[PDB]
């Protein structure tokens, strides 16, 4: 039952029943990402295969000068006198033309407005599903 | 449907004929109540389901309860020359469940 | 709902139900399903077992929209047993939603809108009769409801929408329901001394908008008072669940779920148009029904509390294509009309109860 | 510099738009206008997504699945033909069939992005129209020169670019200070407008889903709060969802905005005229039976009563209303009132105004009450100013209102429609805000007698029970009864049977027949509903008769007559009968498309009044 | 783009069935380079 | 100097269909002071951007709002304060008189596309000019202004009357029963944009301060708003007690207004005041009380049905031998009119107190056997 949930159950399989009462609007998250950096302009791609945290972010960095790739791109990271190739705190864009979405949902479950205690309001809990299991279900649905 | 003031959440809650599904429910002062109460009350005892259709949830509950309730007649004594249809202001559909 | 709704249909069952169509006697074993637990009663089943089916909807090149869908009142003493042909109904219905007069608990009766809490804007948020939209509401009580809810009722019964129009939000809404309304007469109990129309609290011009109307007398007979209470006290025993799992295994029953599918079936496969041979039929069936009244009513002075009026022919011409459906048949013959002014003659000429009427 | 593929998707669109040359000539006659006419048009031309198919497949699914490199292409390839004719940029739009990118708020989601797509629904809410600053111009009185600055944003094309940040000027290369030459900078106007699934198409009981469209420039005020739309464009990720630190910013950049028409909505229905129609409508002109024909298709359906198909008519037409110097206003609009018995189809008549009229909304007695039919007052949540929604009537200014079951509302109600059917116009005078309102709209209206049945040993003060007030203010008060009888029954009944049985064109019989939403779209033998509306629709237009010095004198005749005659009337005689005779006169003369009021119309119009009173 | 593409008057795909009609083909005035290919097979040449 | 000024659009503006829009003013400079609330003017300015104040999520490039920069006011309705008597005003004033009848010419030119009502129109033009407030002595006054009142059978055209009156006059709102209830007669708190301070908001009665105040269908009204029309009749103040409020409003306003017959039309089987629903303590009130009847008469309909249906073929009036003065030129005559204050001597006094003992004496033995309106007092002196 939903009020027999404790500390060991943490990162572990669980089976509930209950009744649903919210449903919010579905979501856009990213699953490849194509960017680019405004200075240099050097490109590069990301791949997320894992959504269920509700963490990949943009890199801050340039990954031109830790990639010292071409005998000639680490002469074009010089010059300019005498100093160092310096793009910026955080220089990517995302393009996003060539970029792929999913679509998220955040629900909310009560436990059974029958077998509750007399006098307490009853307890709920959040859940997060994502790709082939939303619009599933509507509110009133147990 | 109401939002807990603690939590800041929107909640679903039954009457007490909900929350006491196969048990008893125990209606103090039966005759003073109003037209939301009346409708309740029939619904619980003919059909034995509470329906709400509110804030997007529609839904049918369980409403297995026995009651029982006290009630005072009308003026405030008993008229034993009428029959008891004529002595209370509840309605013969409400009497006979 | 009207949404979430199966309309594909596996090989297995199709050829199921062809086979069980072609079964000589069903409409006998099909009346017999609708209720078993009920004594009695059999003009009241067979009307239910046509109203399930409901009429031929026809939409014409006018813009006009005649309905089809069937519409009972059960008036009558009480402990008739008519409450749980309600509740049986809402059961083997593969839509409807039992409510009574002054809606339900937390459950308004007719279309209501409201305003997000969210966005602030407006959304349908609930209302009986757009709930059950393709199916069956049972209105028990109809006696006591409210006049902002009846007038809307009207629409809905007649036209199958309703009109919304406030500051924000202008709209027409599909309600294509069935009425099934069961009302309990003043006075405790129906004296016989005194019209229909007064023995009902409420207006006598609603009365015309339902087809068949069904007067059930809670009449004192002993043998019939001995045969009822055997009825009743074998059901406490146990008999009845063995004399219905039993029979039910030899073709003389259909079951509640197989019952519920083949209705659904029927609905969503066929359209039963009258045959040419039969119209004349009906139409001098009319004439000859009116004529009576006028008779009696030229007699007297004072007008009947039950009149016969244009929606009542259409109760016949609804009636016959509702039989012929449980046949799969794009025609019906003579044995349908036949049946349909029988069935009529049943209910709603129990006007022979009304004063200048009786001649 | 020049990419390789862009150049051959341009060169692909040339050859295309040269191959249907349909859309070269809508180009020419833009410019031709604004030099001719010089209400300058704005640049802009719509194709078709059938003709894509047919002239190339892979350009067709590149628009529909890769819009972000196939539109500006098609773009240049247009500007470049306009500046080729030629003796500021343009721009397209979308139309066709779609397919599976034709979905509403709640079937659009996070796969279709990138892609045109199609929405339906009603739009709830409108901003208010801005300037955006595009070329700033100043000046240096130091120096006598005029120095200026480009800006521009991520909602003005479809691909990404690096970010340029510019700033204000205020200084001079040299410190000499500038002035802001507020006249000669561009301004372009921005607003935006939010999208909801339509009620009717929506789950009962369920929450809404909402879509955010942008529109800019041209497209900037075409349509208001509580309409039946249809957007086309592009459903684009903005931004960074929190990576740089809910998701993605999604909206749509609109190109194309269509209106559309449904039963009980604000928004008019209008078709174009083919000069074949016209054809048509004129010659059916001349035959001296035009009003039979036309009345005898109300509704066919329905039995018998024919004066009221011929009122509705009247109604529908209407007469001329006028303006004098002084400030003066007279009415022109025609109102029905039936009152009959409680099986005679008044509610299918109702019905079928509905379903006919260009713009009508329907109201139910008690249904709608105070602020639903004259207007209510909303705060707005930005600028924080109170403002006003229309109630029903206000909606259906220059159209109809159907009220059933008239003789269930109020008195406060009543008071709040005697304003709106002599004046029309509606005062509201609420905490900060007074105003004055335009009402003009046309009243049919259906009433239940007071006894149930029509009591012909009463008289009708005892049947109808309505204020003599009210009832001066309708110009026909009808009345019906069913009398019970054998012929009668006969040929209605065998009438009726005929109706019950019909086959619409292509069905085995037995086939359930389908139903479908009807959304339109904006710009003796029956005679087709359809063809009444396009009748109508150039009868109210052209045709404004003026009055001759002919029929005066037989309505001078008449009202003369009536009111120094001595029978029990069914309503009361007035000066609004006077007004109603001219009304009446002038909706016939609209029925002919003459340009004057004559005798002949005069009678028919005295011999509908006098039926309908006596 | 960022990276523009430009069009040349080349083929790949064209010349390399030309490279291997060549080295399948020529005979000079068994076939000359598909000698000196089977005397590579059997370790016989280096270049 | 600074003050912000809201426009609106007009009704004859506003497209079909939709609800009409607002724009922002400055003025600065001695121009400040020019514009008051329910003027209809032409102000010409100078169209000029300002920074943008709405929600930051919803901001896409450069967006601005803009503003008015006053520079020029005209009013289509001249003030009678403003009148001030130069050389032009003299000329067209002395033709007005030079052609006499005055009186006459100037009632008949009030609607002249209403058939028939002279005596109404009569009542009219003098409760247009008025008469003279007298502070007796002690700080007390007398109000020298006259409220009227109209009363008759449907389709008489009161409605179109009190329309045109209030075209007329410089200061004049029109208001009908029910749709002008409560705050929207009296006043209103609402706290400043601009200066941030709590002022109070005038309605209908409060804009028509020195002006003329129309009301339509006068017996639906709520006895909350009778109240307050009784006080302002009497002595012309509003005086309100209610949270958040304690003041008084100076509120110097003529009434007019119509009323129709309890049963719709006049039953002369009834009593007089049995057909009226208003108390005879407000039609004490009133200085001239018109009812105005519909009997039908064969003779009289002719001469009403040719005017209304010449009107309806012909946009003028049908009169070839009447002149009708211009509104503009009627607002001059009247401006000078009402600067002059004339005084009674003791021949007429010996005039009005003779002819008030004859009335208070005929009066009583009318309202004996039940059949007026009012028995005779020394407010119908007052307005005499
Ligand atoms: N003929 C009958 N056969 C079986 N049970 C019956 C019969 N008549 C009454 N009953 C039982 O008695 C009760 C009758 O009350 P109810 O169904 O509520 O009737 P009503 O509609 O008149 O109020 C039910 O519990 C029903 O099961
Ligand atoms: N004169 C008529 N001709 C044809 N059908 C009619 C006629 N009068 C009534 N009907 C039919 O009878 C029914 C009348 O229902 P309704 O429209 O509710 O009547 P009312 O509005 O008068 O109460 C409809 O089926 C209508 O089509
Ligand atoms: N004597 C009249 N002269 C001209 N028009 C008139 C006359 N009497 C009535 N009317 C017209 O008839 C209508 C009456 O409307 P209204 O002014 O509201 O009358 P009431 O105030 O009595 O209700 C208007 O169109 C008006 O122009
Ligand atoms: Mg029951
Ligand atoms: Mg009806
Ligand atoms: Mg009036
Ligand atoms: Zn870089």
Redesign the pocket.
């Known amino acids: 039952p939903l009020r027999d949930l404790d500390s060991e159950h943490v990162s572990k399989i669980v089976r509930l029943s209950g009744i649903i009462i919210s449903t919010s609007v579905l979501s856009s998250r990213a699953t490849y990402l194509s960017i680019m950096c405004r200075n240099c302009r050097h490109t590069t791609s990301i791949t997320i295969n894992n959504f269920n945290s509700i963490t990949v972010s943009l890199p801050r960095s340039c990954l031109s000068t830790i990639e010292s790739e071409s005998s000639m791109a680490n002469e074009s990271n010089i010059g300019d006198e005498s100093t160092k190739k310096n793009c910026g705190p955080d220089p990517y864009i995302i393009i996003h033309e060539s970029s792929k979405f999913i679509d998220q949902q955040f629900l909310k479950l009560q436990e059974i407005p029958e077998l509750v205690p007399v006098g307490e309001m009853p307890r709920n809990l959040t859940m997060t599903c994502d790709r082939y299991l939303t619009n599933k279900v509507i509110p009133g649905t147990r | 449907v109401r939002k807990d003031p603690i939590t800041k959440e929107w909640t679903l809650e039954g009457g007490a004929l909900v929350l006491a599904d196969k048990g008893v429910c125990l209606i103090d002062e039966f005759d003073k109540m109003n037209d939301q109460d009346r409708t309740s009350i029939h619904e619980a005892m003919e059909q034995q389901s509470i329906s709400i259709s509110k804030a997007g949830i529609v839904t049918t509950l369980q409403a297995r309860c026995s009651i029982i309730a006290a009630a005072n007649p009308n003026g405030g004594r008993y008229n034993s020359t009428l029959p008891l249809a004529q002595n209370v202001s509840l309605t013969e559909p409400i009497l006979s469940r | 709902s009207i949404w979430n709704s199966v309309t594909m249909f596996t090989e297995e069952e199709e050829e199921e139900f062809l086979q069980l169509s072609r079964n000589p006697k069903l409409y006998e074993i099909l009346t017999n399903s609708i209720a078993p637990?009920?004594?009695?009663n059999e003009d009241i089943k067979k009307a239910i077992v046509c109203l399930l089916m409901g009429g031929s909807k026809k939409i014409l090149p006018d813009g006009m929209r005649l309905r089809g869908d069937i519409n009972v009142l059960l008036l009558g003493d009480?402990?008739?047993?008519?409450?749980?042909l309600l509740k049986f109904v809402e059961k083997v219905s593969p839509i409807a939603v039992y409510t009574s007069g002054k809606g339900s608990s937390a459950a308004g009766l007719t279309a209501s809108v409201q305003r997000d809490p969210m966005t602030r804007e407006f959304y349908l948020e609930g209302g009986a009769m757009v709930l059950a939209d393709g199916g069956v509401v049972c209105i028990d009580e109809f006696d006591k409801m409210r006049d902002e809810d009846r007038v809307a009722i009207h629409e809905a019964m007649e036209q199958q929408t309703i009109s919304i129009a406030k500051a924000g939000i202008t709209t027409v809404l599909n309600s294509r329901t069935s009425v099934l309304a069961?009302a309990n007469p003043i006075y405790g109990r129906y004296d016989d001394l005194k019209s229909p129309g007064d023995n009902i609290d409420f207006q006598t011009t609603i009365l015309s908008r339902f087809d068949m109307i069904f007067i059930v007398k809670d009449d004192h007979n002993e043998e019939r008072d001995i045969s009822?209470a055997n009825?009743?006290i074998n059901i406490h025993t146990g008999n009845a669940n063995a004399m219905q799992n039993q029979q039910e295994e030899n073709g003389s029953e259909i079951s509640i779920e197989k019952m519920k599918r083949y209705i659904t079936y029927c609905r969503l496969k066929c359209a039963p148009r009258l045959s040419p041979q039969a119209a004349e039929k009906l139409s001098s069936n009319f004439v000859t029904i009116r004529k009576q009244l006028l008779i009696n009513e030229l007699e007297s002075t004072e007008r009947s509390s039950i009149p016969i009026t244009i929606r009542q022919l259409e109760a016949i011409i609804r009636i016959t294509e509702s039989l012929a459906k449980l046949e799969l048949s794009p025609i019906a013959q003579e044995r349908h009309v036949d049946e349909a002014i029988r069935l009529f003659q049943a209910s709603t000429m129990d006007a022979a109860s009304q004063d200048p009427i009786g001649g | 510099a020049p990419d390789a593929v862009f150049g051959d998707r341009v060169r692909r669109f040339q050859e295309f738009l040269d191959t249907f040359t349909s859309y070269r000539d809508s180009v020419r006659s833009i410019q031709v206008y604004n030099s001719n006419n010089a209400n300058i048009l704005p640049h802009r031309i719509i194709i078709s997504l059938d003709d894509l198919r047919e002239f190339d497949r892979s350009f067709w699914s590149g628009i529909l699945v890769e819009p972000a490199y196939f539109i500006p292409p098609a773009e240049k390839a247009l500007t470049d033909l306009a500046d080729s004719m030629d003796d500021h940029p343009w721009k397209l739009s979308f139309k066709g069939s779609f397919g599976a990118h034709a979905l509403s708020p709640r079937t659009l989601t996070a796969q279709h992005l990138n892609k045109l797509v199609s929405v339906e629904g009603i739009v709830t809410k409108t901003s208010l129209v801005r300037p955006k600053l595009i070329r700033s111009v100043h000046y240096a009185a130091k120096t006598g020169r005029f120095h200026y600055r480009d800006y521009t944003d991520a909602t003005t094309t479809l691909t990404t670019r690096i970010p340029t940040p510019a700033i204000y000027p205020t200084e001079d290369t040299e410190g000499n200070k500038l002035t802001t030459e507020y006249g000669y900078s561009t301004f372009i106007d921005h607003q935006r407008i939010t999208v909801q699934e339509m009620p009717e198409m929506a789950p009962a009981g369920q929450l809404p889903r909402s879509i955010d469209v942008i529109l800019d420039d041209d497209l900037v005020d075409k349509t208001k709060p509580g309409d039946r739309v249809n957007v086309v464009g592009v459903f684009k990720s903005l931004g960074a969802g929190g990576m740089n630190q809910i998701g993605f910013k999604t909206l749509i950049l609109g190109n194309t905005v269509y209106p559309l028409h449904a039963r009980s909505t604000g928004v008019a229905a209008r078709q174009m005229l083919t000069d074949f129609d016209i054809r048509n409508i004129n010659k059916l002109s001349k035959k001296k039976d035009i009003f039979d024909i036309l009345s005898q298709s109300l509704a066919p359906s329905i039995y018998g009563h024919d004066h009221i198909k011929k009122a509705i008519l009247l109604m529908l037409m209407g007469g001329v209303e006028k303006n004098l110097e002084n400030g003066s206003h007279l009415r022109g609009d025609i109102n029905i009132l039936m009152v009959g018995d409680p099986s005679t189809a008044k509610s299918q008549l109702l019905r079928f105004v509905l379903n006919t009229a260009s713009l009508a909304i329907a109201t139910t007695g008690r249904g709608s009450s105070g602020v639903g039919l004259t207007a209510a007052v909303t705060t707005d949540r930005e600028t924080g100013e109170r403002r006003l929604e229309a109630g029903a009537m206000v909606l259906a200014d220059r159209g109809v209102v159907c009220i059933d079951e008239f003789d269930k509302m109020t008195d406060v109600d009543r008071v709040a429609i005697h304003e709106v059917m002599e004046q029309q116009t509606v005062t509201i005078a609420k905490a900060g805000i007074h105003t004055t309102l335009n009402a003009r709209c046309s009243v049919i209206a259906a009433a239940n007698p007071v006894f149930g049945q029509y009591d012909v040993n009463r008289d009708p003060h005892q049947n109808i029970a309505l204020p003599d007030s009210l009832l001066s203010r309708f110009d026909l008060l009808f009345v019906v009864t069913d009398d019970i009888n054998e012929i009668r029954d006969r040929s209605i009944s065998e009438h009726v049977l005929r109706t019950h049985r019909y086959l619409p064109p292509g069905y085995l019989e037995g086939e359930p027949v389908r139903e479908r939403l009807n959304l339109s779209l904006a710009v003796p033998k029956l005679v087709t509903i359809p063809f009444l509306r396009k009748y109508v629709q150039y009868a109210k237009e052209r045709v404004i008769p003026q009055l001759t010095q002919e029929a005066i004198n037989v309505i001078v005749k008449n009202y003369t007559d009536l009111r120094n005659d001595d029978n029990t009337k069914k309503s009361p005689i007035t000066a609004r009968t006077l007004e109603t005779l001219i009304r009446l006169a002038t909706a016939h003369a609209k029925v002919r498309l003459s340009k004057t009021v004559n005798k002949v119309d005069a009678k028919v119009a005295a011999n509908l009044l006098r039926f309908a009173l006596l | 783009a960022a990276l523009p593409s430009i069009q040349l008057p080349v083929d790949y795909n064209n010349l390399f069935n030309e490279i291997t009609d060549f080295l399948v083909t020529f005979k000079q005035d068994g076939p000359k380079y598909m000698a000196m290919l089977q005397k590579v097979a059997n370790r016989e040449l280096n270049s | 100097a600074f003050q912000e000024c809201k426009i609106q659009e007009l009704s004859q503006q506003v497209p079909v269909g939709h609800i009409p829009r607002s724009l922002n003013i400055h003025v600065n400079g001695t121009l400040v002071r020019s514009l008051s609330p329910g003027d209809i003017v032409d102000v010409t300015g100078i169209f000029l951007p300002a920074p943008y104040t709405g929600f930051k999520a919803l901001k896409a490039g450069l967006l601005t709002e803009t503003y008015l920069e006053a520079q020029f006011v005209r009013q289509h309705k001249k003030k009678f304060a403003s009148f001030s008597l130069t050389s032009d005003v003299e000329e067209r004033v002395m033709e007005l008189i030079t052609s006499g009848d005055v009186y006459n010419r100037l009632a008949k030119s009030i609607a002249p596309e209403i058939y028939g009502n002279l005596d109404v129109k009569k009542a009219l033009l003098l409760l247009l000019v008025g008469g003279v407030d007298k502070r007796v002595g002690d700080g007390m006054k007398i109000r020298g202004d006259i409220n009227v009142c109209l009363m008759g059978d449907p389709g008489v055209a009161k409605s179109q009357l009190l329309k045109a009156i209030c075209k007329i006059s410089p200061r004049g709102v029109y208001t009908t029963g029910k749709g002008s209830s409560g705050v929207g007669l009296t006043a209103a708190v609402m706290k400043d944009p601009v200066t941030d301070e709590m002022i109070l908001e005038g309605g209908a009665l409060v804009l028509a301060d020195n002006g003329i105040c129309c009301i339509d269908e006068f017996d639906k009204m709520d006895e909350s708003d009778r109240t307050a029309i009784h006080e302002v009749m009497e002595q012309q103040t509003i005086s309100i007690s209610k949270a958040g409020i304690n003041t008084t409003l100076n509120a110097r306003t003529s009434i007019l207004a119509a009323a129709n017959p309890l049963y719709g039309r006049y039953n002369p089987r009834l009593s007089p005041l049995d057909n009226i629903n208003l108390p005879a303590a407000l039609l004490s009130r009133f200085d001239i009380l018109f009812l105005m009847l519909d009997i039908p008469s064969r003779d009289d309909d002719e001469k009403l049905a040719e005017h209304v249906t010449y009107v309806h073929m012909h946009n003028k009036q049908p009169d070839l031998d009447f002149t009708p003065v211009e509104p503009s030129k009627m607002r001059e005559y009247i401006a000078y009119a009402k600067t002059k204050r004339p005084v009674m001597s003791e021949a007429v006094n010996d005039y009005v107190v003779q002819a008030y003992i004859r009335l208070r004496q005929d009066s009583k033995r009318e309202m004996d056997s039940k059949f007026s309106f009012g028995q005779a007092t020394p407010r119908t002196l007052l307005g005499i």
């Open positions: 637990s009920i004594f009695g009480p402990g008739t047993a008519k409450s749980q069961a009822i009825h009743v």
